[PDB]
Amino acid sequence: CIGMIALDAQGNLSGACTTSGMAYKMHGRVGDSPIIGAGLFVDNEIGAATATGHGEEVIRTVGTHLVVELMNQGRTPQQACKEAVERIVKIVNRRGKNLKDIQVGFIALNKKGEYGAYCIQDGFNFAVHDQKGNRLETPGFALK
Amino acid sequence: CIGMIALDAQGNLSGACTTSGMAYKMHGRVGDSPIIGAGLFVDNEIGAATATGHGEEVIRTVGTHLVVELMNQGRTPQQACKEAVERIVKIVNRRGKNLKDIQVGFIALNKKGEYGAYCIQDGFNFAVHDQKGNRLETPGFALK
Amino acid sequence: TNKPIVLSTWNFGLHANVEAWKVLSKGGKALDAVEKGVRLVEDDPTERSVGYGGRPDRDGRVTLDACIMDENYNIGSVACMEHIKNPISVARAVMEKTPHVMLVGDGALEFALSQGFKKENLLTAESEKEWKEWLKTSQY
Amino acid sequence: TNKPIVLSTWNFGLHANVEAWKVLSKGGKALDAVEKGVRLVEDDPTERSVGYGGRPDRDGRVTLDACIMDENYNIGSVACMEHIKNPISVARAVMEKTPHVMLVGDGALEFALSQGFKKENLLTAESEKEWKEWLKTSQYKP
Numbered sequence: 302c303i304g305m306i307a308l309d310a311q312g313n314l315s316g317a318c319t320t321s322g323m324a325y326k327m328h329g330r331v332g333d334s335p336i337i338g339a340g341l342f343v344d345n346e347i348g349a350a351t352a353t354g355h356g357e358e359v360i361r362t363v364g365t366h367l368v369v370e371l372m373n374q375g376r377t378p379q380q381a382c383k384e385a386v387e388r389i390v391k392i393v394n395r396r397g398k399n400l401k402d403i404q405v406g407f408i409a410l411n412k413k414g415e416y417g418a419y420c421i422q423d424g425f426n427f428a429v430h431d432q433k434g435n436r437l438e439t440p441g442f443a444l445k
Numbered sequence: 446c447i448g449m450i451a452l453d454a455q456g457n458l459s460g461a462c463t464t465s466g467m468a469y470k471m472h473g474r475v476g477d478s479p480i481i482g483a484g485l486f487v488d489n490e491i492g493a494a495t496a497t498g499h500g501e502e503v504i505r506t507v508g509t510h511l512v513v514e515l516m517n518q519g520r521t522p523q524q525a526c527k528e529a530v531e532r533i534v535k536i537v538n539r540r541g542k543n544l545k546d547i548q549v550g551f552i553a554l555n556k557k558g559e560y561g562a563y564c565i566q567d568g569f570n571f572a573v574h575d576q577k578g579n580r581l582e583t584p585g586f587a588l589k
Numbered sequence: 590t591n592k593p594i595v596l597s598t599w600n601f602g603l604h605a606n607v608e609a610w611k612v613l614s615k616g617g618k619a620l621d622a623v624e625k626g627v628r629l630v631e632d633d634p635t636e637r638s639v640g641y642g643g644r645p646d647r648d649g650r651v652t653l654d655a656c657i658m659d660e661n662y663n664i665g666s667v668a669c670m671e672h673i674k675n676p677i678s679v680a681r682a683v684m685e686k687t688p689h690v691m692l693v694g695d696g697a698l699e700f701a702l703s704q705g706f707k708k709e710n711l712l713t714a715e716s717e718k719e720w721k722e723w724l725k726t727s728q729y
Numbered sequence: 730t731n732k733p734i735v736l737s738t739w740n741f742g743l744h745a746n747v748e749a750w751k752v753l754s755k756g757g758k759a760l761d762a763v764e765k766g767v768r769l770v771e772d773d774p775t776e777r778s779v780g781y782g783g784r785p786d787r788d789g790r791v792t793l794d795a796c797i798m799d800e801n802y803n804i805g806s807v808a809c810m811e812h813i814k815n816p817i818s819v820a821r822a823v824m825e826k827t828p829h830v831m832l833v834g835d836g837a838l839e840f841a842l843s844q845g846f847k848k849e850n851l852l853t854a855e856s857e858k859e860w861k862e863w864l865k866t867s868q869y870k871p
């Protein structure tokens with residue numbers, strides 16, 4: 302899975318998400334990457350988000366739609382990704398699962414070009430390229 | 446397509462959605478009915494919702510996830526279905542499409558057992574069964 | 590709190606509600622009630638937009654889509670699955686019996702068969718007849 | 730406003746961003762930039778979680794999932810599609826060339842072939858080798 306979101310010179314957003322999925326998955330298994338609202342969601346009036354990790358969990362919480370609605374409600378891309386991750390955390394707990402077994406990350410961008418990210422566990426980085434250049438950044442994570 | 450949502454005696458919610466999809470659709474076409482957050486979404490602390498109508502439009506707006514998040518923000522099932530429909534109306538217009546060609550409806554239920562429904566066009570109805578018995582009701586609609 | 594209570598889409602939902610109520614009125618789980626409720630429509634050949642009797646895709650193939658979600662975020666889904674009359678129940682098995690939440694196409698059928706579901710011909714004479722008339726008018 | 734700007738997941742996103750930037754820096758559409766950007770990874774047989782070279786399902790079949798969304802609620806998606814190296818572009822075609830927004834399985838491949846995409850063997854020697862080793866440790870019977 303590689304998810305990519307961008308804001309162009311016209312001030313327009315778009316995104317793409319593509320994967321070969323979870324290695325050795327059951328035949329016919331589908332994760333979040335092709336599901337709008339789960340692996341990817343773009344609203345030109347608000348922002349965009351894409352998710353990666355254990356697809357089942359992103360589908361379960363309709364993750365990117367959540368991240369974008371949070372930005373719609375006033376959160377910065379960063380805060381939105383964080384609050385979204387925290388929802389998967391509460392749910393993982395409600396389902397009696399162990400957070401160590403799950404990995405979910407979100408990266409987001411709003412109409413102003415501000416961006417952010419957050420993930421359940423350490424280890425995930427994302428790349429960001431703007432006029433200042435291209436860089437690899439590491440977001441905060443919930444499982445400390 | 447039939448979508449069904451219920452609140453049981455323990456105060457727990459659940460839902461089911463099943464369809465043979467759009468008649469004579471392209472082979473391999475998938476609508477909103479099997480997509481969590483699109484044709485169906487249930488959150489036990491908030492409420493549940495299911496959609497029917499042109500599947501493509503429900504997927505496009507991640508319809509039921511929207512209805513349930515609106516209830517989470519404070520809307521009654523009825524208001525949540527109405528606002529959700531009004532979002533499809535704005536998007537239909539932004540995309541230069543004609544509302545008369547599009548039918549979308551939602552029915553919703555919250556933890557108190559209050560329910561609601563709304564649709565784009567007149568002509569849709571839903572069945573509700575509680576201790577007052579079983580009946581067919583008609584929701585409001587946007588295209589008048 | 591108004592409970593129990595069930596809502597379903599369209600006129601046939603009135604009949605589906607009766608089946609769901611057999612479960613809800615006896616204190617049964619919402620999960621069981623909504624599965625039983627919709628299976629009724631999947632089973633009925635005269636309900637042309639759900640399961641058995643469903644109108645096929647343009648190539649004459651009846652492919653079904655269904656998903657289910659319980660009270661604790663457990664989910665199951667099958668899409669574009671052929672030959673299985675009760676996709677909502679296969680979706681429930683995806684939810685309960687696999688580490689996945691969505692299976693599609695051939696793999697969905699294979700999983701259904703592995704779970705004991707039986708391969709059946711979902712194309713009714715009536716649906717086949719209408720399909721053929723559509724081929725004439727649409728010229729596909 | 731900080732624009733143009735592009736974000737992508739994981740370390741290989743850095744190299745993918747460079748491709749997207751070739752479009753973004755010349756004033757091109759976000760839609761074109763993100764498609765070009767991820768196609769780079771899809772084409773790369775050494776990136777085993779995307780496109781060509783992707784690790785197969787437990788039966789040895791490489792099946793791909795992808796979706797795309799533009800600036801005006803247009804969407805396209807393909808899931809569990811075989812033999813097509815660039816599922817992101819088939820998703821784009823689903824969006825632009827059909828009244829539907831999601832095609833899966835055999836139907837997705839048929840559509841791709843109809844749009845001129847070429848059927849190819851996405852299973853590499855490396856992925857096949859690893860798959861077989863997994864079969865040994867997991868003991869699954871395909």
Ligand SMILES: CC(=O)N[C@@H]1[C@@H](O)[C@H](O)[C@@H](CO)O[C@H]1NC(=O)C[C@H](N)C(=O)O
Nearest residue numbers: 302322323332333353354355356739778
């Ligand atoms: C769970 C998983 O397969 N994660 C993969 C991760 O290990 C790997 O580093 C990255 C990038 O190569 O790809 C991940 N794959 C996914 O994101 C899975 C996908 N979201 C899905 O189908 O659910």
Ligand SMILES: CC(=O)N[C@@H]1[C@@H](O)[C@H](O)[C@@H](CO)O[C@H]1NC(=O)C[C@H](N)C(=O)O
Nearest residue numbers: 446466467476477497498499500599638
């Ligand atoms: C748009 C559509 O196909 N509407 C169908 C409607 O005519 C019919 O009365 C009811 C119930 O029989 O089913 C509807 N089908 C859908 O809702 C389609 C489904 N949401 C999808 O796959 O898009």
